[PDB]
Ligand binder design. Structure first.
Ligand code: ACP
Ligand code: FGR
Ligand code: MG
Ligand code: MG
Length: 602
């Protein structure tokens, strides 16, 4: 913070004005600036057009846009609105790529079942009409003060309608439609960059949220894209107008002249800076030619949304904020878009540890998911209760989504627990017949300044997991400073995996013999040997289950949907094993251990 203020003073050549301070306090905050993770993320292998979402081609005619963000700090103080809004925001990111939001996936980490979080998410995804196709839930008293709310959203988009995430030429303009701008969330980005005992941990930093407004925003935006009116786009969230406008031009290496007075207000007494950093929801920033602005405004208004032309794209690398004919601020656009970078430390792993038992409560509760009808599997090739969620796109074309993390293992060894989480995410994808395609990930950490190693260990392990597996990183998020009066959460890296699979070849449950296939302990080397065995059996028609517990209550619940009931003598397993359960007619034949342990029937 203060180390940064000096750097700002040196660059500015003098002391910043009130608004200059407010503005950089947002853009250079860890949440928007990424000072501590910038270099690490760069060292990661990438793929797919990365524009605040990350899209991956599936069949050349269609691509899937998937991204994972989080809303941790907000949810610790206002569970209901913090979770909902989290969904609202990640949906705007996927929509901002020209994609049609088709699936939401949740990843909760709490010390008990906080109804608010569950409902906030279910209600919001419900009012906008986008289904929940899955979502891991880990309970541990270690998240008592810092619950982690990570949400993954995937949309489908035509390869020929991909929207850019930046401005591309001087003369373009920037329209901002959606809900009206109020005073909620000001500095909520600076709030998410500190310990929960900060001076900004008040309800003022929390964003509201209106799904009916968003559903409209989804319809309007897609219409704009269908008529080729969108030349570039970015959703609004942290930083509001400031963040969005400056980032669309910094990316293109252009400039902008923002006119705050043209921004639709919901509170007319607001001041220029309040209008600039307000983090109100349901708003989208579209880049286009001056001429198309007319139809875009018409489309949003008839859709019951406000908005007007707010900025002009100029070739000069300056960010000029205007309110009428009175200048508010003015600084080098590339100054804002780039926070000071912090040095990284090199991490070198040790031997895979003898992970001991550290259980995460088995509070399986579908009761709460039914009360708030948080349906998790209405329209998938095969039910999500089993793990991977498979969606169709064509009769014989589809993709899989897997969200996994092993904070339990990582808590003991940041490196190995993380690396293992990424690898296990591959077993699941393979277990359903899908071809690992890319990864979106969310890094959930505490104080980097205090414990720099642990962060380094997460990023190195994630980097090594992609090099060892060949699976690149399409996108991600990084939530740091998840601590309460000192105490930090466990290092929790949540992995979102996307895969390619023919829905006509996805196996379903049927009366059969069950087999424990693999080893009860972990060894990196032979990991690729299990992968090869899953591909073989999966290809033969076998129904495979890849859980860290082998068999869970949900699996059995889901099994009853088929009127099937399993009787198996599960093998004793270590905290990190290399085993999966195979269901087939005959005994599997593979270059890996196989043992008949039970039966599925009726
Ligand atoms: N751990 C990670 N791995 C890979 N990419 C990551 C990453 N963390 C961040 N990114 C990439 O950096 C980009 C920026 O995330 P950032 O949180 O700063 O902005 P944003 O685009 O989400 C808008 P906002 O701040 O308004 O929410 C992401 O869109 C993603 O592609
Ligand atoms: O509406 C936009 N939501 C997008 C967004 O970027 N929101 C911002 O992130 C904070 C949570 O970050 P975390 O604690 O999870 O790291 C939240 O308080 C918002 O200011
Ligand atoms: Mg983010
Ligand atoms: Mg965003």
């Amino acid at each position: 913070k203060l180390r940064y203020l000096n750097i700002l003073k040196e660059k500015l050549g003098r002391e910043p004005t009130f608004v200059e301070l407010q503005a950089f306090s947002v853009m250079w905050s860890e949440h928007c600036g990424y000072s501590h993770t910038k270099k690490y993320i760069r060292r990661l292998p990438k793929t797919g057009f990365e524009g605040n979402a990350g899209v991956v081609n599936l069949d050349d005619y269609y691509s899937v846009a998937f991204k994972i963000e989080s809303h941790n700090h907000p949810s610790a103080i206002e569970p209901y609105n913090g979770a909902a809004t989290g969904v609202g925001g990640i949906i705007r990111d996927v929509l901002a790529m020209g994609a049609r939001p088709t699936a939401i996936f949740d990843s909760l980490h709490m010390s008990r079942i906080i109804d608010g979080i569950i409902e906030g998410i279910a209600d919001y995804g419900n009012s906008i009409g986008v289904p929940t196709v899955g979502g891991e839930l880990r309970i541990s008293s270690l998240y008592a003060h810092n619950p982690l709310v990570n949400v993954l959203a995937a949309g489908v988009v035509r390869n020929d309608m991909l929207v850019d995430s930046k401005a591309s030429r001087p003369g373009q303009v920037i329209v901002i439609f959606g809900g009206a701008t109020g005073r909620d969330g000001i500095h909520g980005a600076s709030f998410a960059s500190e310990d929960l005992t900060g001076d900004k941990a008040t309800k003022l930093s929390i964003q509201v949220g209106d799904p009916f407004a968003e559903k409209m925003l989804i319809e309007a935006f897609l219409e704009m894209v269908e008529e080729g009116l969108v030349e570039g786009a970015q959703d609004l969230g942290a930083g509001g107008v400031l963040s969005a406008t400056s980032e669309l031009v910094a990316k293109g290496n252009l400039g902008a002249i923002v006119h705050l007075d043209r921004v639709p207000l919901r509170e007319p007494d607001m001041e220029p800076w309040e209008i600039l950093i307000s983090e109100s929801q349901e708003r989208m920033a579209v880049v286009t030619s001056p001429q198309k602005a007319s139809r875009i405004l018409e489309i949003a208004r008839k859709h019951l949304l406000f908005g007007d032309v707010v900025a002009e794209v100029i070739e000069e690398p300056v960010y000029r904020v205007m309110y009428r004919n009175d200048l508010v601020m003015e600084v080098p656009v590339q100054l804002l878009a780039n926070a000071p970078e912090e040095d990284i430390v090199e991490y070198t792993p040790g031997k895979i540890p003898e992970f001991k038992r550290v259980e995460f409560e088995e509070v399986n509760a579908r009761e709460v998911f039914e009360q708030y009808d948080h349906m998790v599997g209405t329209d998938t090739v095969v039910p999500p209760g089993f793990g991977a969620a498979v969606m169709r796109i064509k009769r014989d074309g589809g993709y899989s989504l897997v969200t996994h993390s092993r904070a339990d293992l990582a808590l003991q060894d940041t490196y190995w627990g993380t690396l293992i989480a990424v690898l296990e995410s591959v077993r699941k994808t393979l277990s359903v017949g899908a071809e690992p395609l890319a990864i979106t990930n969310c890094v959930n950490y505490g104080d980097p300044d205090v414990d720099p190693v642990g962060l380094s260990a997460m990023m190195t392990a994630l980097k090594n997991a992609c090099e060892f597996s060949g699976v690149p990183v399409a996108s991600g998020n990084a939530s740091l400073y998840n601590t309460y009066q000192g105490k930090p959460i466990p290092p929790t890296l949540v992995v979102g995996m996307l895969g390619k699979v023919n829905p006509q070849k996805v196996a379903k449950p049927k009366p059969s013999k069950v087999f424990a296939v693999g080893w009860n302990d972990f060894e990196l080397e032979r990991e690729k040997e299990l992968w090869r065995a899953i591909r073989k059996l999966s290809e033969e028609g076998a129904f495979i289950l890849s859980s860290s517990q082998l068999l869970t209550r949900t699996h059995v619940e889901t099994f009853r949907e088929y009127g099937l009931k399993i009787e198996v003598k599960l093998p004793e397993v270590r905290p990190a094993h290399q085993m999966v359960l195979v269901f087939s007619e005959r005994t599997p034949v593979v270059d890996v251990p196989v043992k008949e342990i039970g039966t599925l029937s009726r």
